[PDB]
Write a protein that binds this DNA or RNA. Structure first.
Ligand SMILES: Nc1nc2c(ncn2[C@@H]2O[C@H](COP(=O)(O)OP(=O)(O)OP(=O)(O)O)[C@@H](O)[C@H]2O)c(=O)[nH]1
Ligand SMILES: [Mg+2]
Lengths: 86, 435, 81, 74, 116, 534
RNA sequence: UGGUUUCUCUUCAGAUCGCAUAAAUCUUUCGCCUUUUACUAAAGAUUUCCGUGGAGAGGAACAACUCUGAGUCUUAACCCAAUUUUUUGAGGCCUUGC
């Protein structure tokens, strides 16, 4: 019916999980049939997705920037934070 | 809303109020004198709605005072402009065909009624008489087919929602057969000028440049002066005499002090329009007025020829785009002829205009004329050009006011009613009232 | 044709980074990007999984065997969708 | 769609082919199809030992092609 | 030496003869009178003197009722037919001199202009 | 008020582009410098009007003519001429979709204004010729073929007003194809007579010569029409289909393939059929069948006009049908991007004919590298007037380095040489302007390859000069002065009426001397002012 | 995410129109010329009249409607299994890090 399930989360900050187990967090700006994704201001995490880990929240973080991810290698997505206003 | 009254009410009011010598109506003797200050305005509307020699009878709405003091005609004559030009071209053709085919044309006597004759009453002399045949040229039922049903009505396609809106009669929407038929009915009043390159030095801005200086044009208007060791005659090669039209064509370079000068649009690309003769020939063909091409080249350039063993073939579901439709219909050459046509006839839809606002003979005095004509008509064409230039020059923009509506404030009062009457009856009323 | 694909074609002529399915990282000028994500690049720096670098003049990578691409931020300014 | 890979530029050039399984071969491009299956002539297997062995003219299925690199200038 | 101007005129068929008349009244020598392929207008290529070409466009469009249209470029220099130094020929003050002493007239005018 | 330069009032409603413009400026190979020339008035302005009408939506709709962008003056807007070479710059996409940056120099077409065309042609690395389809090759067409072949640029022509074949001449499709092929062959002949190079031959199969009627916004190359034909239909290779369209090539409906002779049964060409048959169908069904059978034609083309759009007159309705059928002006983008050497390649033949010294080991390689860094150099040639202001801005292009706002400037003149440093002097940039013709907008910096207006350097730039870094050990020459197609012949003697204001008159005379590129204002021994013109 | 002919009132619109074109007042020259009107023909400054457009309100309908074309639980059979995608060359093991 609605097709909205992806379009809803568009412009939002999104936590995307890759098939190797990486975590890509960026601004979800576009998708397609294959679920190839366009992620603005995107960083990569490896060790953790923090839920306020008292030791530290961030280890092996890398700044990537503007990322196009191929859908083949995507597993899943959840909402990480609201859209930046800019 | 105040509604229409029976037409006998104003008739018996004018009949009882005679020469105002009866004692019984003496209280209205004052009111009629006040109505004198509106008798110019009541004249204007009376002559604004004159009924058009293809018409036998026009019924106009009438705003009249309750005493019978005055009769205004409350109507603006909207006349849709292509139909108006076609109807006057019809009148032109019929009057030429009548003046050639009549043994003696007796002229009317111009004081038509004698000085001591009282004016004739409408209700007995004119009301019961069948009027006459009007002029109204006979139209071909096959060739003038989309026009013949409605061409000589007053406001022709008024109650048809497909061609105009409503009864205010303001916006018209015709079809291209209608515009084609109205265009070849009006050829006697139109021109054959496809582009305005004819009006190079003979147009509006050129005449403004002429009026700004002291120059006249040999076929153009003459005006009043707007301003009222260098040029040694032994230092100047007079090779070609300075022809006077250079001061219009290039105004800064050939004059000193060009004040209040106007620039000139000088060239349009020459519109090359082939007028077709007969519909036996197709819509667009190679006309024998056009020069042939006949390609010649010295050594063949190696233009790409993708040869055999390219194995590029089209799929099954592809075709040329519009191969189902024919190349041309019977209405294609007519529409191309309607592309290069004068300003009423070159369009599908527009907004209605007044009978006042449509100059039928304006294109005739705007062009320069062949010299074989007498002196009289040359002076007349020059003076009409001068009138056109003085109209175009001192045109300040319309200066948007607050609208005033005199006849809407008269019929909001209790002293005015409204009816619908024959134009001749209201004219007899206006003459009796002014007397 | 997909929205991301149009944005990829837009990056032709720009310097881009590509990671393969095997994690080799190729950075250089994107010459041609096909619809299926096949990528022709030039004057490459490649960073292997052990960390070592190399230099290549000309490469072409199959779309399927690409994990992702990093494009300039020059593009970020397709906001309609 | 049913597109060709844009490889005419690479025709009859010597190439270095990275295949899946950490496999690498080198040879001259002799042709291709829409699946990116290749014909490679004078092909040489670059064994993980470092040793290289001549295998002649071969077919590589596009499926298992990770990456190619030209050893020439195109 | 006198500068000449190359003039191309696009004109209808009777306007070709009109252009030929107007251009021949200015020491013309019409170069080419070829038709335009695929058009009923003709191209008239010609040379003209550049002292004779002050308003040739305006006169031409006046005489052809705005049908013919003319453009003019500079490309040429050739000899004035008059003797530039000739004390026998006396130049009239305002009257235009014929061809045998145009160079004498133009030299005397340019001499009186600045140099003396 | 002393403003007559027609309401700049800067409000562009371009779609999603502000930063993108300056982002494509910073790429230096994604920019194209095109100049546009015609014999007189051959539709160049209404062309660029349709291009900007593509560019700027929700405003920018013109009714019963526009021509504001290359016709922004008021004497210019009434004469019919474009008297100035008013530039414009936009971004607009390709058939694929990758939007390029176009700097359109929009030159005059009048013969006496070839100065403007020369000055635009020297700064742009590509020329685009406009020929009226109903006219053919003309005077200034041949003159600008000469001037374009001489000053070493790529050459491409675009045949305009192909509607006048249809609606005015009313030729058959085969005869109109013959006339278009005749125009293309005459262009190739005039190029082949002049150029000693041979790799500049233009043919519609190659893709450089286009066809574009411009009151109704038709613009197609063979690639563009094939892209339309393939976007409607299936998976046809539109490049390979576009390759086999122009020139003595027939479609055999049995073998479904393109041959050279094989159907000889009074068939038509591939171009004649596939191009000119549906185009004449659209034209004829608009001009003569709007009431009867036009929506039946529009439903066969996927064109959906509303109830209000169907009630138009024939000119706007024909333009609207051709806009909804042809869409964008991507064929022009094809013939530009595929055939104009964007100024990495463009640097070398330009710098080998502009610069005085040559290819030598200091200046030449730094020019041809054309990175936005190093020996800051430019070439300003046009001097565009502000409405009220005495100052009139310089217009040039950045070859090497960048230009920043407030960055000081050494203006090397033209009487300057290497050992004569008394002509040149030093100034500072007032403001940097990039213009959309009818609007102006500021930038903080301009990289290499881009066109730029400079404010504040106007005093030493009489007609030709170069811009360089101040007090820098970078010693170089000047670019060559402006070789012109015509030579200024007409001499006008000039003297004031009142002799009490000779300085103000000499001031304005110097200003108009700085404005026009071939105006020559001198004083002879008798003391009368002499103006030489074209 | 969805529907107009006529009448009146109010308000805002004349830097490219009303694709037509009148008269008046003032001030300055004039042009004739018994003086005043009535005028000649120009420039300028202002106004009146015949017309016009956009928006809003109300009235007079003499048009007819809500599983209807478009849905926030209905409705374009087609984005539904052979190398470039939504159907696995997988499978197995081991070492390093708090
Ligand atoms: N028939 C036809 N006329 C056109 C077309 N495009 C423009 N014109 C007209 O041709 C005349 C020339 O148009 P412009 O574009 O102003 O002239 P130009 O080609 O720019 O040349 P310049 O006047 O020197 O600037 C104008 O009157 C246009 O209305 C066209 O496609 N077909
Ligand atoms: Mg007295």
């Amino acid at each position: 019916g609605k097709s909205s399930k992806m379009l809803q989360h568009i412009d939002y900050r999104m936590r995307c999980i890759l098939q190797d187990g990486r975590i890509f967090i960026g601004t979800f700006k576009a998708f397609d049939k294959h679920m190839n994704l366009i992620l603005c201001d995107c960083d990569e995490f490896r060790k953790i997705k923090p839920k306020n880990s008292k030791q530290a929240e961030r280890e092996e973080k890398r700044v990537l920037g503007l990322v196009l991810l191929r859908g083949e290698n995507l597993v899943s997505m959840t909402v990480e934070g609201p859209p930046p206003k800019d | 809303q105040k509604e229409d009254m029976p037409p006998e009410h104003v008739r018996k009011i004018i009949r009882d109020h005679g020469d105002m010598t009866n004692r019984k109506f003496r209280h209205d003797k004052r009111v009629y004198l006040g109505a004198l200050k509106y008798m110019p305005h009541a004249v204007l509307k009376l002559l604004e709605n004159m009924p058009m020699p293809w018409e036998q009878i026009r019924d106009v709405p009438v705003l009249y005072h309750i005493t019978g003091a005055i009769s205004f005609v409350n109507e603006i004559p909207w006349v849709i402009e292509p139909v108006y030009i076609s109807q006057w071209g019809s009148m032109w053709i019929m009057m030429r065909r009548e003046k050639r085919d009549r043994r003696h044309f007796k002229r009317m006597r111009f004081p038509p009624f004698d000085d001591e004759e009282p004016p004739l009453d409408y209700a007995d002399n004119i009301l019961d008489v069948e009027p006459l045949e009007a002029i109204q040229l006979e139209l071909d039922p096959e060739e003038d087919a989309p026009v013949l049903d409605w061409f000589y009505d007053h406001q022709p396609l008024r109650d048809s929602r497909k061609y105009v809106n409503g009864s205010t009669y303001q916006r018209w929407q015709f079809t291209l057969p209608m515009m084609s038929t109205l265009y070849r009915l009006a050829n006697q009043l139109l021109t054959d000028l496809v582009d305005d390159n004819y009006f190079y030095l003979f147009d509006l801005k050129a005449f403004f440049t002429s009026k700004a200086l002291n120059m006249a044009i040999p076929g153009g208007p003459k005006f009043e002066p707007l301003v009222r060791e260098f040029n040694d005659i032994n230092k100047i090669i007079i090779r070609q005499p300075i022809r006077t039209e250079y001061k219009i064509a290039f105004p800064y370079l050939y004059n000193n002090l060009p004040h209040h000068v106007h620039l000139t649009w000088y060239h349009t690309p020459n519109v090359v329009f082939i007028k077709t003769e007969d519909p036996d020939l197709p819509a667009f063909y190679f006309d024998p007025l056009i020069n042939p091409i006949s390609h010649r080249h010295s050594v063949k350039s190696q233009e790409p020829l993708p040869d055999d063993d390219e194995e590029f073939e089209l799929p099954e579901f592809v075709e040329p785009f519009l191969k189902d439709t024919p190349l041309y219909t019977d209405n294609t050459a007519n529409g191309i002829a309607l592309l290069w046509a004068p300003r009423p006839f070159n369009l599908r839809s527009g907004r209605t205009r007044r009978a006042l606002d449509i100059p039928l003979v304006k294109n005739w005095y705007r062009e320069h004329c062949p010299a074989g004509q007498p002196v009289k008509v040359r002076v007349s064409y020059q003076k009409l050009l001068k009138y056109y230039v003085l109209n175009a020059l001192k045109h300040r923009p319309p200066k948007a006011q607050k609208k005033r509506y005199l006849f809407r404030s008269f019929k909001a009062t209790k002293f005015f009613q409204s009816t619908k009457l024959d134009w001749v009856e209201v004219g007899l009323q206006v003459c009796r009232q002014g007397y | 044709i997909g929205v991301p694909i149009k944005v990829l074609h837009e990056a032709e002529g720009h310097i881009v980074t590509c990671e393969t399915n095997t994690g080799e990282v190729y950075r250089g000028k994107l010459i041609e990007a096909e619809d299926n994500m096949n990528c022709q690049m030039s004057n490459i720096t490649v960073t292997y999984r052990d960390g070592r670098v190399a230099q290549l003049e000309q490469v072409y990578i199959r779309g399927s065997k690409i994990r992702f691409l990093i494009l300039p931020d020059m593009l970020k300014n397709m906001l309609k969708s | 769609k049913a597109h060709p890979p844009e490889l005419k530029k690479f025709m009859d050039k010597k190439l270095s082919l990275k295949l899946n399984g950490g496999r690498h071969v080198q040879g001259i491009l002799r042709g291709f199809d829409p699946f990116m299956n290749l014909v490679i002539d004078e092909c040489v297997e670059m064994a993980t030992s470092g040793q290289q062995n001549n295998i002649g003219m071969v077919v590589i299925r596009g499926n298992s092609i990770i990456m190619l690199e030209a050893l020439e200038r195109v | 030496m006198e500068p000449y101007y190359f003039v191309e005129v696009q004109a209808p068929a009777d306007c070709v003869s009109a252009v030929y008349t107007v251009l021949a009244r200015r020491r013309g020598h019409v170069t080419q009178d070829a038709p335009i392929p695929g058009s009923p207008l003709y191209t008239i290529k010609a040379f003209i003197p550049a002292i004779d070409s002050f308003g040739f466009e305006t006169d031409l469009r006046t005489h052809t009722q705005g049908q013919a249209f003319s453009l003019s470029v500079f490309h040429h220099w050739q000899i004035v037919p008059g003797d530039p130094l000739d004390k026998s020929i006396v130049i009239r003050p305002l009257e235009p001199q014929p061809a045998p002493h145009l160079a004498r007239e133009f030299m005397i005018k340019t001499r009186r202009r600045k140099g003396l | 008020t002393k403003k007559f330069t027609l309401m700049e009032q800067t409000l562009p409603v371009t779609v999603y582009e502000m930063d993108f413009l300056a982002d494509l400026m910073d790429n230096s190979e994604l920019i194209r410098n095109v100049t546009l020339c015609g014999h007189l008035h051959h539709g160049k302005t209404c062309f660029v009007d349709c291009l900007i009408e593509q560019t700027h939506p929700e405003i920018r709709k013109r009714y019963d003519q526009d021509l504001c962008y290359t016709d922004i003056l008021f004497t210019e807007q009434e004469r019919g001429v474009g008297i100035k070479s008013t530039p414009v710059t936009v971004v607009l996409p390709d058939t694929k979709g990758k939007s390029y940056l176009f700097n359109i120099m929009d030159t005059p077409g009048h013969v006496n204004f070839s100065d403007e065309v020369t000055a635009g042609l020297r700064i742009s690395d590509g020329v685009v010729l406009f020929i009226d389809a109903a006219e053919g090759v003309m005077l200034n067409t041949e003159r600008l073929i000469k001037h374009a072949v001489q000053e070493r640029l790529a050459v491409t022509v675009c045949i305009n007003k192909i509607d006048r074949l249809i609606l005015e001449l009313k030729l058959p499709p085969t005869d109109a194809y013959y006339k278009l092929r005749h125009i293309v062959d005459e262009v190739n002949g005039l190029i082949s007579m002049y150029s000693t190079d041979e790799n500049l031959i233009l043919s519609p199969l190659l893709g450089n010569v286009c066809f574009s009627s411009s009151q109704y916004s038709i613009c197609f190359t063979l690639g563009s029409f094939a892209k339309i034909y393939a976007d409607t239909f299936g998976d046809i290779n539109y490049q390979e289909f576009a390759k086999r369209l122009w020139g003595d090539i027939y479609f055999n409906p049995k073998t479904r393939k393109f041959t050279k002779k094989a159907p000889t049964s009074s068939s038509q060409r591939s171009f004649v059929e596939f191009i000119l048959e549906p185009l004449y169908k659209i034209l004829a069904q608009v001009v003569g069948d709007v009431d009867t059978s036009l929506p039946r034609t529009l439903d066969e083309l996927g064109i959906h006009l509303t109830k209000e759009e169907l009630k138009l007159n024939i000119r706007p309705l024909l333009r609207l049908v051709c806009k909804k059928f042809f869409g964008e002006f991507t064929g022009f983008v094809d013939m530009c991007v595929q055939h104009i050497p964007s100024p990495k390649v463009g640097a070398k033949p330009k710098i080998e004919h502009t610069y005085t010294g040559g290819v030598d080991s200091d200046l030449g390689e730094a020019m041809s590298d054309c990175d936005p860094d190093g020996p800051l150099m430019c070439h300003t040639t046009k001097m565009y007037s502000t409405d009220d202001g005495v100052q009139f801005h310089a217009f040039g292009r950045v070859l090497s380095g960048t230009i920043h706002a407030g960055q000081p400037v050494k203006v090397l003149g033209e009487n300057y040489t290497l050992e004569d440093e008394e002509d040149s002097q030093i100034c500072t940039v007032g403001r940097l302007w990039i213009s959309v013709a009818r609007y102006h907008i500021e930038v903080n910096r301009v990289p290499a390859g881009n066109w730029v207006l400079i404010e504040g350097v106007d005093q030493p730039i009489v007609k030709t000069a170069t811009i360089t870094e101040p007090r820098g050990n970078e010693e170089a020459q000047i670019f060559r002065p402006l070789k012109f197609n015509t030579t200024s012949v007409i001499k006008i003697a000039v003297e004031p009426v009142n002799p009490s204001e000779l300085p103000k008159m000499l001031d304005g005379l110097r200003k108009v001397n700085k404005s026009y590129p071939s105006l020559t204002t001198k004083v002879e021994e008798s003391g009368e002012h002499v103006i030489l013109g074209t």
